[PDB]
Each structure stands twice: as C-alpha cells, then as structure tokens.
Swiss-Prot record, chain B:
Disulfide bonds join C111-C122, C161-C205. It comes from Severe acute respiratory syndrome coronavirus 2. Changing N48K: In strain: Omicron/BA.1, Omicron/BA.2, Omicron/BA.2.12.1, Omicron/BA.2.75, Omicron/BA.4, Omicron/BA.5, Omicron/BQ.1.1, Omicron/XBB.1.5, Omicron/EG.5.1. Changing D29N: In strain: Delta/B.1.617.2, Mu/B.1.621. Changing Q33H: In strain: Omicron/BA.1, Omicron/BA.2, Omicron/BA.2.12.1, Omicron/BA.2.75, Omicron/BA.4, Omicron/BA.5, Omicron/BQ.1.1, Omicron/XBB.1.5, Omicron/EG.5.1. This is Spike protein S2'. The chain holds residues 922 to 1147 of 1273 of the full protein.
Curated annotation (Swiss-Prot), chain C:
Precursor of the fusion protein processed in the biosynthesis of the S protein and the formation of virus particle. Mediates fusion of the virion and cellular membranes by functioning as a class I viral fusion protein. Contains two viral fusion peptides that are unmasked after cleavage. The S2/S2' cleavage occurs during virus entry at the cell membrane by host TMPRSS2 or during endocytosis by host CSTL. Changing N37K: In strain: Omicron/BA.1, Omicron/BA.2, Omicron/BA.2.12.1, Omicron/BA.2.75, Omicron/BA.4, Omicron/BA.5, Omicron/BQ.1.1, Omicron/XBB.1.5, Omicron/EG.5.1. Changing D69H: In strain: B.1.1.318. Disulfide bonds join C11-C33, C16-C22. It comes from the Viruses. This is Spike protein S2. Glycans are attached at N74. Changing F133L: In strain: Eta/B.1.525. The record marks R88, S89 as: Cleavage. Residues 165-214 are annotated as: Heptad repeat 1.
UniProtKB/Swiss-Prot annotation, chain D:
This is Spike protein S2'. The chain holds residues 1018 to 1066 of 1273 of the full protein. It comes from the Viruses. Disulfide bonds join C15-C26. The gene is S. Subunit of the fusion protein that is processed upon entry into the host cell. Mediates fusion of the virion and cellular membranes by functioning as a class I viral fusion protein. Contains a viral fusion peptide that is unmasked after S2 cleavage. This cleavage can occur at the cell membrane by host TMPRSS2 or during endocytosis by host CSTL. In either case, this triggers an extensive and irreversible conformational change that leads to fusion of the viral envelope with the cellular cytoplasmic membrane, releasing viral genomic RNA into the host cell cytoplasm.
Length: 75, 226, 214, 49
C-alpha cells in the first residue's frame, strides 16, 4: 500500500507492473492515474509502442493511398 | 475523394472543440495568470507590513502627523515593494508573449501566405496550406497537411543497367512487384514503364553497388520500326 | 542547453527557520511566500515541457534491426550499447564524463535512462526510415538510397553518390572517429552546458551565503 | 533556456526529422542529415554536411 520512488515516498497508490501514458507526473518516470472497483495506480511512464522497421539492403516501402488531415495549433 | 476528406476533416474540429476544454489550455492559461497577478497585487493592500493598521485613512484619522510618518513609512516601503515585484513579473511575462507573438507572425507568414517545407513547422506531416482564425487574445491556425497512409513492401534496387550503361531514375525510384520492374514516384505508388524519359545514362554496370540486370524501353524504336 | 535543475525553496523555513516568533512576523507580509513558491513551481513544470518538446517528438520508439549493413557506414559509435549496463551509446558516455537547507531539488520528470531511448528512436527512424517517419508511418528504405535522395536535396545528381559510395563511406566513417578524439582531449568543448549548471549552483551558494549576514 | 529549448526543438524537427535548406542553420555547408545525442540537461547534434 506504500510505494517508494527515486523521487520520494508515495502513499495511497498501487504500483503496477504495466505501463501507460503519463496522466499525472511524479518524478523519475513514475506517473499516477485513477483507474480500475477503481483506485489510484502509479507506474513507470510508457513511451509508446515499441516498433521495428523491416530494414534490408534491398527493401523499400511506398505509400499507395493518402490521408489529408487538419490539426489545430494555438498561440 | 480529397474533397470529402477535407470536408470531413473540418467537421471533426468542431467536435474536437465543442466538447473538450483542454484544447484552449494556452489562452485560458495566460488569462488565469494575470488574474492571480492582479489579485495578489490587490490582496497586498490588506497587509499591515508592521504598521498598526492597513487603512491609510484610518492611521491618519487616529494619529497626528509627527509619528504617523513612522507608521506610514512602514506601509510605503511595503506596498512600493509589492508593485515592482508585480511589474517585474509582468515584464518577464511580457517578453514570453512577444516571443510567442513573433513565432505566431512567422508561423502566419511562412505557413499561410506560402507553403513551407520545414517539417513540423506547420503540423505533423507534409504541409499543404493553413487557415487562421481569430481567438480571444490569440490566434488559432488550421494546418492542412498531406499524410501518406497505405503502404506496401517492395523489392527495390538503386540502379539498373541494360547495355552495360547504368540507368538511374530522374524522379522516383525503382521498384519491382516481384516479376516486372517499374520506376515510380517516391511518395505515391504509380508504376510507370522504365523508359529513357525516366532515366539518364551514367557510367556502366560494374561500378555501382547493387545494380540489377534488366531492359529499358525505348520510345523511338517502335516508331522507327514503322 | 535544454533544461535547468528543477529547484525549489521552502520560503518559511528559509526565512524564519523553526521559530514561531519569527514566523509570526512574516505573516504580516502577506503572500510573498505564496508567490515565490508559485513562482518557482512555475519554473519547475516548464523545465519539463522543455524536455518533453525537444525529445518526445516521435510517436513510436523505433529500433534498428540487428544487422548493420548500411552501405558501408559504421554507426557503432552512436547506436546504443546492449553490453554496457546503461542503455546509452558510446559517444554519449563521453558526454556524461565531460560534465561535472530548506532547498529541495525535484528530480527531472524524465531520466537519462529514458532520454536515451528517444535519442535511440530518432536515431533509428532516420537511419532506416529516411525522413518519412517524421511525416507519417515509418517506411524502410535502403540507406544507400537515402543518401541518393538527400543529394537531390542539395542539387547534386544521384549518380555521383553511387559512383563514389565506398569513398564516401570511409570519409563518413572517419568523420565520426574524429568526434571521439575531438571530445576526448578537448574537455572544455562543452562550455555551454557546463556553464548552465555552474550558473545555478553559483546562485544557490550566493543564496545560502546570504544567511550569514546580519 | 526556453529560448534555447525552442531553438533546439526547431532544430530537432527541421534538421533531423527532415532536411533543411536554411544555409548555415545546420552546420557550415549544405546539410545532409543530422543525428542527435543526449547530454546532461542538454542535447548535442551531429550535423552531417
């Protein structure tokens, strides 16, 4: 019921072996969030899915259809 | 097809703005800060700073001047400090906004009145155009960006040679569906027959690494054949 | 330079350490504790929006394939080291070696362990997927070609690359090699970063030393 | 610092994720590509020109 960080001591949250995006930052890559019956979990920050490209000295990948998109940006 | 995507693209923005508040964090932020800046400035007026009261009219009403200056001076040096802290804060924050402003202006110039190639200076992906919109104390852009979607593996080769002479592409690369060989442009598969209009001779086979034997088509020979 | 040290200071115990009589008087001065603790905290969070923006710019952490047949180019210097306990690259290790109350120091949100992963990712996207992976889904493309592309970017026809491949490789591979030695001997080559840390400790010492004046 | 941060952020975007033509913005010479490397509190690029 008590977790220990390289950033400090945490009370009232559960360490989880899983990994997720950072909902609330803590420190040293530990982030806390509220989730499933439900409680507060804290865990190692995740950095997106690990992906590998199939490189090879004679292999290329070419798009064949395309998507327009519209993204906001505020200043 | 592009039309519907663009039309569909805009529509999702309305939803992306109608429901969630987090999108306008930045503008809604700077307004919040100044509120605290003001409130903290206003709240200071009630601090006594060590004098016997906080009301300047009271301290006068209760004392004749000669020791009032002992009291009032305590307020003056108190509040007078409180301003220049607030001012310096505003000055510091002032610079940040302008840094955003000049970035905005440039991000308006290079991204609206033109078309940039500075990747991720106009939203993720290749940039096509951009539309601005008004906003309280700020501006909101709408980058319209092209993004490749559906991809396919292909067996490529940097160069092909046909008569000893090596042939390279003019625009695009060489790909093969496994059986035939095609040259195609480099951002949208569109196989074209490999021909002397697409290529240009240089050197000979045995120097370039990884060249493949093949045959380049000639437009003229069939014409001459007639 | 990218980020300072997320410093913070307890106003109350720094001014009136463990004395209500002192702490009583400070209560007259209103909210100067409230601002400063807000002021510094404002700095602290920014010191992570900083790092989050320089590095966290690729969605998926890529990673190179096991082989290293990149047309002749030896990237062993800059790719991460699995043998080495730390998940870093060789040249990075030089950089780590080259850089040396009432006042807490909040540790940075990201760690050098994680930071190395992004710089592993970007160094994997560029090495393999050309420059596409910035725009969209990463596309593999033989590294020799990517140069041939990038030559067209500077107005030089593809043919000079392939006809000069091996010659370029040694030039490139050699070019990296000088970096190790250039950084190895010239310790002072990182004056910029070293200055940032020095400046901040400079202030803190000045901040502490002020207590000993009446 | 944030000024340097943004300047870094722009470089990592323009100078790494793609290839820029802003002369003398990616190391003296025509720019080819650029790899980044981590560093304490900071970033180091390798502009390949």
């Amino acid at each position: 019921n008590v977790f220990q960080t390289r950033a400090g001591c945490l009370i009232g949250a559960e360490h989880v072996n899983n990994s997720y995006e950072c909902d609330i930052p803590i420190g040293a890559g530990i982030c806390a969030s509220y989730q499933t019956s439900q409680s507060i979990i804290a865990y190692t920050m995740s950095l997106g899915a690990e992906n590998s490209v199939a490189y090879s000295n004679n292999s290329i990948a070419i798009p064949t259809n395309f998507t327009i998109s519209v993204t906001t940006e505020i200043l | 097809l592009i039309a519907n995507q663009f039309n569909s693209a805009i529509g999702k923005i309305q939803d992306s703005l109608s429901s969630t508040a987090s999108a306008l964090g930045k503008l809604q932020d700077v307004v919040n800060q100044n509120a605290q800046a003001l409130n903290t400035l206003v709240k200071q007026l009630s601090s006594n700073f060590g004098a016997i009261s906080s009301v300047l009219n009271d301290i006068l009403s209760r004392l004749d001047p000669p020791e009032a200056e002992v009291q009032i001076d305590r307020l003056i040096t108190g509040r007078l400090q409180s301003l220049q802290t607030y001012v310096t804060q505003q000055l510091i924050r002032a610079a940040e906004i302008r840094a955003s402003a000049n970035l905005a202006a440039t991000k308006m110039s290079e991204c609206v009145l033109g078309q940039s190639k500075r990747v991720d200076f106009c939203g993720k992906g290749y940039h096509l155009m951009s539309f601005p919109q008004s906003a309280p104390h700020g501006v909101v852009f709408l980058h319209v960006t092209y993004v490749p979607a559906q991809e396919k593996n292909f067996t490529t080769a940097p160069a092909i040679c046909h008569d000893g002479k090596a042939h390279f592409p003019r625009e695009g690369v060489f790909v093969s569906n496994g059986t035939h060989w095609f040259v195609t442009q480099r951002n949208f598969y569109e196989p074209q027959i490999i021909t002397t209009d697409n290529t240009f001779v240089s050197g000979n086979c045995d120097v370039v690494i990884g060249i493949v034997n093949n045959t380049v088509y000639d437009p003229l020979q069939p014409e001459l054949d007639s | 330079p990218v980020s300072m040290t997320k410093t913070s200071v307890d106003c109350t115990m720094y001014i009136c350490g463990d004395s209500t009589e002192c702490s009583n008087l400070l209560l007259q001065y209103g909210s100067f504790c409230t601002q400063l603790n807000r002021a510094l905290t404002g700095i602290a969070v920014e010191q992570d929006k900083n790092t989050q923006e320089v590095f966290a710019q690729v969605k998926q952490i890529y990673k190179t394939p096991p082989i290293k047949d990149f047309g002749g180019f030896n990237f062993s210097q800059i790719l991460p080291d699995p043998s080495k306990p730390s998940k870093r690259s060789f040249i990075e290790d030089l950089l780590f070696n080259k850089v040396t109350n009432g006042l807490t120091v909040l540790p940075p949100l990201l760690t050098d362990e994680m930071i190395a992963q992004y710089t592993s990712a970007l160094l994997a996207g560029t090495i393999t997927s050309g420059w596409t992976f910035g725009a969209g889904a990463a596309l593999q493309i033989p590294f020799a070609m990517q140069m041939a592309y990038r030559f067209n970017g500077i107005g030089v026809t593809q043919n000079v690359l392939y006809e000069n491949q091996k010659l370029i490789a040694n030039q490139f591979n050699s070019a990296i090699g000088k970096i190790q030695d250039s950084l190895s001997s010239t310790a002072s080559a990182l004056g910029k970063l070293q200055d940032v840390v020095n400046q901040n400790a400079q202030a803190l010492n000045t901040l502490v030393k002020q207590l000993s004046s009446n």
